[PDB]
Design a binder for this molecule. Structure first.
Ligand SMILES: Cc1cc2nc3c(=O)[nH]c(=O)nc-3n(C[C@H](O)[C@H](O)[C@H](O)COP(=O)(O)OP(=O)(O)OC[C@H]3O[C@@H](n4cnc5c(N)ncnc54)[C@H](O)[C@@H]3O)c2cc1C
Ligand SMILES: N[C@@H](Cc1c[nH]c2c(Br)cccc12)C(=O)O
Length: 637
């Protein structure tokens, strides 16, 4: 009988197949001939976009140890070509067929296929991905539509990509919204560019959930009164977060869109716009679209006449060309019968770590946990080590399953509280998930074992990418030592994000919210750095039309649209005049000061250590024994 059957091979299954081949575990893959969305987008020539996730979090450790030389955002073409390169390695192990039913029993599972062939396996892994209706909308989208009005009822990464393609052709975008969370995918720290995944320092949650809440949540929750932040200029971008009932922040279930801020897009791509646009690097600054009025937010109750294709706002019956409603992604799961009898019903919170459904036996889910920020690779690489250890080591399989129900209950209370299950429950902060899996597997690090300040920087400030836990130990990948060294040298050993915790150690949430936005350019949604890129935007729109071979008449002025923009931007026109020039930027001066201190005692032992320095050395000493380190779902009962 087959030891392992993997149903679905695209991207999530790659790191698991690598570990099974290394231990020479008997496995077989069954994946359909149709392929994935990247296959459909390749055949139609629609891989002309880039990832919302950084290279260091979007490619696997065993690829990064060879190819990493700098931080950047890969293209969809590079992402798919990596999918194809690995499929070529493992094509001999893939049966091209479609699984239609799985009958799960106490020790094995009976797998049925579309061709009629039957397979038995002791361990079954599902890595089939998700179905999304927006995928087909992207696959049939005509990029030549011009001078039309579009109404979106949902905002997301796919809607933002569609808007990025609609803006340059003089298309007007109406968002009937109940709010959305948008974050600059790259920010500046003292002028230097940082992708947002670099500044999350998740292990500071072990100090206190309140400190880490003040570290992260001011750009999400309306905590600052600073008139330069987008959620003060456009209050309809605010979401209702009354569902949050956990003390772990950012909460599980929170989703955000990652976009190019126009100032960072200009920094990277201005000197070769047409080539970068053709490569897939598209300006998608939703904050810039609201600033210029190319996108307006209207209340969700704004009346739409779907018969006449009109939307009534600002006393205007605005005709629209197309209405866009996003869907909810659902896992591509085949029919699964518990004990061969009872249909299994998927529920993320009824699985352990998104991997182990407790209603089934020896069935594992790979690729259904979504990262809040960064690429899926961080999640699926850690999931693949977790699944591999469960499959190949019976004492670990036993240790996890003996109290599986209690682990799931303890996990849900920690990350969801008393909140009822939501459709977005599968979204987790990547630095929390990778660390949780590392502690479950035993490839984690110990904060009490740091001896120098450099050790505390690596533990707390170095991002919890998958490869961070593959330097030594059971699942070490060769070359990670050089990779971690290269990453440390290019990011000043992450002292800058370490210093942020130093700077807000004695602040309350309101003081930290104001300190976050006291910078000349605060990380996310800074509306002071948009107007200065208006002329560049015109250059961008022209470069886009040349790449796409489009002729767009942008002379006819839409006085009706300008009237709706004025109605929609009343709050902006009231709060933006209150933006005041300042002589000191507290965050910049505090972070620059702390970096000087940290880099001066970088190699000193913590035991071998006039006031800011004194409270910082005390803060550094307390880091050896964090008081919020307990994670109940890690324990065996
Ligand atoms: C438009 C879009 C943009 C994205 N951008 C990013 C990004 O920037 N960064 C990021 O980290 N992630 C991104 N993702 C998510 C992720 O990278 C992709 O979803 C990727 O395909 C990984 O999914 P997967 O390998 O789990 O499943 P897939 O690769 O989608 O599918 C695995 C395979 O399983 C097969 N299969 C399914 N059901 C069966 C069955 N019953 N029997 C047999 N075979 C089956 C399918 O045919 C498919 O070929 C994006 C996703 C989409 C749709
Ligand atoms: N702590 C840094 C970066 C940061 C804050 N909040 C974030 C969220 Br939410 C997602 C990703 C990154 C960040 C800062 O304060 O600028």
């Amino acid at each position: 009988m087959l030891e392992v059957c993997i149903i679905g091979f695209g991207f999530s299954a790659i790191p698991l197949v690598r570990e099974l081949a290394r231990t020479q575990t008997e496995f077989q893959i069954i994946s359909a001939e149709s392929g994935s969305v990247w296959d459909r987008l390749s055949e139609s020539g629609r891989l002309d976009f880039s990832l919302v996730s950084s290279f260091q979090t979007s490619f696997y450790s065993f690829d990064l140890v060879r190819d990493y030389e700098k931080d950047y955002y890969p293209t969809a073409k590079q992402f798919y070509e990596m999918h194809e390169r690995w499929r070529s390695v493992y094509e001999e192990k893939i049966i091209r067929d479609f699984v239609t039913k799985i009958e799960n029993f106490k020790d094995y599972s009976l797998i049925s296929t579309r061709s009629g062939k039957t397979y038995e396996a002791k361990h079954v892994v599902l890595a089939t991905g998700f179905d999304r209706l927006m995928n087909t909308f992207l696959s049939n989208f005509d990029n030549h539509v011009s001078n039309k009005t579009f109404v979106f009822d949902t905002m997301g990464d796919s809607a933002n990509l569609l808007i990025a393609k609609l803006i340059p052709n003089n298309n007007k975008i109406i968002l009937r919204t109940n709010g959305f969370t948008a974050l600059d995918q790259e920010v500046q720290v003292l002028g230097k560019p940082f992708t947002l995944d670099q500044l999350e320092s998740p292990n500071f949650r072990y100090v206190s959930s309140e400190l880490y809440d003040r570290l992260m949540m001011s750009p999400v929750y309306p905590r600052t009164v600073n008139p330069a932040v987008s959620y003060n200029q456009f209050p309809l971008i605010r979401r209702d977060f009354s569902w949050v009932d956990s003390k772990s922040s950012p909460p599980n279930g929170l989703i955000a869109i990652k976009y190019w801020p126009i100032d960072q897009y200009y920094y990277h791509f201005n000197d070769d716009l047409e080539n970068y646009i053709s490569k897939g690097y598209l300006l998608n600054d939703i904050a810039m679209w609201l600033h210029t009025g190319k996108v307006i937010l209207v209340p969700s109750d704004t009346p739409i006449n779907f018969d006449k294709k009109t939307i009534t706002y600002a006393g205007i019956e605005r005709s629209f060309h197309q209405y866009v409603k996003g869907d909810a992604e659902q896992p591509r799961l085949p029919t699964i019968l518990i004990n061969g009898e009872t249909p299994f019903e998927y529920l993320y919170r009824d699985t352990f770590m998104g991997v182990i459904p407790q209603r089934l036996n020896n069935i594992y889910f790979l690729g259904y946990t979504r990262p809040f920020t960064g690429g899926l690779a961080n999640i699926t690489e850690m999931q693949s080590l977790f699944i591999h250890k469960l499959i190949t080591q019976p004492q670990f399989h036993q240790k996890i399953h003996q109290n599986l129900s209690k682990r799931i209950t303890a996990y849900n209370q920690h990350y969801y509280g008393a909140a009822k299950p939501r459709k977005h429950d599968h979204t987790v902060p990547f630095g929390f998930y990778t660390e949780d899996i590392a502690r479950l597997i035993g490839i984690h690090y110990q904060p009490n074992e740091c001896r120098s300040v450099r050790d505390l920087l690596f533990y707390y400030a170095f991002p919890n990418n998958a490869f961070k836990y593959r330097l030594k130990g059971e699942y070490a990948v060769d070359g990670v030592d050089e990779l971690i060294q290269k990453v440390n040298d290019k990011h000043d050993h992450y002292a800058q994000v370490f210093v942020q915790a130093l700077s807000i150690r004695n602040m309350n949430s309101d003081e930290a919210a104001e300190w976050d936005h006291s910078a000349r350019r605060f990380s996310f949604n800074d509306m002071r750095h948009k107007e200065g890129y208006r002329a560049f935007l015109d250059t961008y729109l022209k470069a886009y039309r040349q790449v796409e071979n489009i002729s767009v008449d942008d002379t006819v002025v839409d006085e009706e649209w300008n009237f709706m923009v004025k109605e929609a931007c009343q709050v902006r026109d009231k709060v933006a005049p209150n933006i005041e020039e300042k002589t000191h930027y507290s965050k910049d001066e505090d972070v620059n000061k702390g970096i000087r201190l940290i880099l001066s005692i970088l190699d000193s032992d913590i035991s071998s250590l006039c006031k800011f320095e004194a409270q910082s050395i005390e803060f550094i000493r307390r880091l050896l024994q964090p008081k919020n380190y307990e994670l109940l779902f890690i324990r065996e009962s």
